[PDB]
C-alpha cells in the first residue's frame, strides 16, 4: 500500500481492476478497469429495511 493506500508494486506500479459501483457497491465486470483503492475511512450505518 502506497501513501494513498493503493495497491502498488516496488516501483509504485498501481494495481488496477474492476471497481465496485452502486449503493451498496457491487462488482461490475462490464465496468472499466480502475485502480483498486483501500481507504481507512470508517463505515457509516445503513438503516434496516428488511428482516
Amino acid at each position: 500500500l502506497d501513501e494513498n493506500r493503493n495497491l502498488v508494486n516496488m516501483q509504485g506500479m498501481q494495481l488496477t481492476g474492476y471497481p465496485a459501483t452502486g449503493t451498496p457497491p457491487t462488482i461490475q465486470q462490464g465496468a472499466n478497469p480502475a485502480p483498486i483503492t483501500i481507504p481507512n475511512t470508517l463505515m457509516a450505518a445503513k438503516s434496516t429495511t428488511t428482516a
Partner: protein, 151 residues
Amino acid sequence: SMQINLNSTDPVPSKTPFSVSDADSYNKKGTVTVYDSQGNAHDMNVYFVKTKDNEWAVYTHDSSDPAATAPTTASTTLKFNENGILESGGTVNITTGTINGATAATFSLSFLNSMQQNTGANNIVATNQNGYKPGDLVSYQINNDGTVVGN
C-alpha cells in the same frame, strides 16, 4: 461496435421498470469510451434487460454529464432469431452530453456479430470505437514495406 454474448436463462428482473440506480433492474451493464471534438472522454454505460424471449432492450446513458437526462425510453431493442442470429435493431444513433463546450458525440453504435445462446455467464466479447484523445510523438519506425509509422 459492441459485440456481446447474451444468456437465454437469465430471469426477467422483478424490479420493473428500468432504473439507473437499481443495479438489479438490469441484466447486464457494459461501458464504452467515446470522445468528442475537444477529446473529452464519455463513458457510455449501456444496460441490457431481457423483455421476452429473443428480445433485449438496450439503454444508454453517459456518466460524464451530470446534466444529462435519465434514460427512461428504449435506446434500442435487439430482436434475435431461433439459432442466435441477429434479426433487427442492431444499430442505433447515440448522442452524448455537452461537456466543457465540447459538442455532443453523435455516433452510430452497432450490435453486429452479437450472438445469444446458453452462456454460463454475462460477458462482452468486444468493444471497438474509432475515436481517441490527442496524442504526441513518442516514437517513429520504418516497416519492412517502407511505411514510416509514428507511434
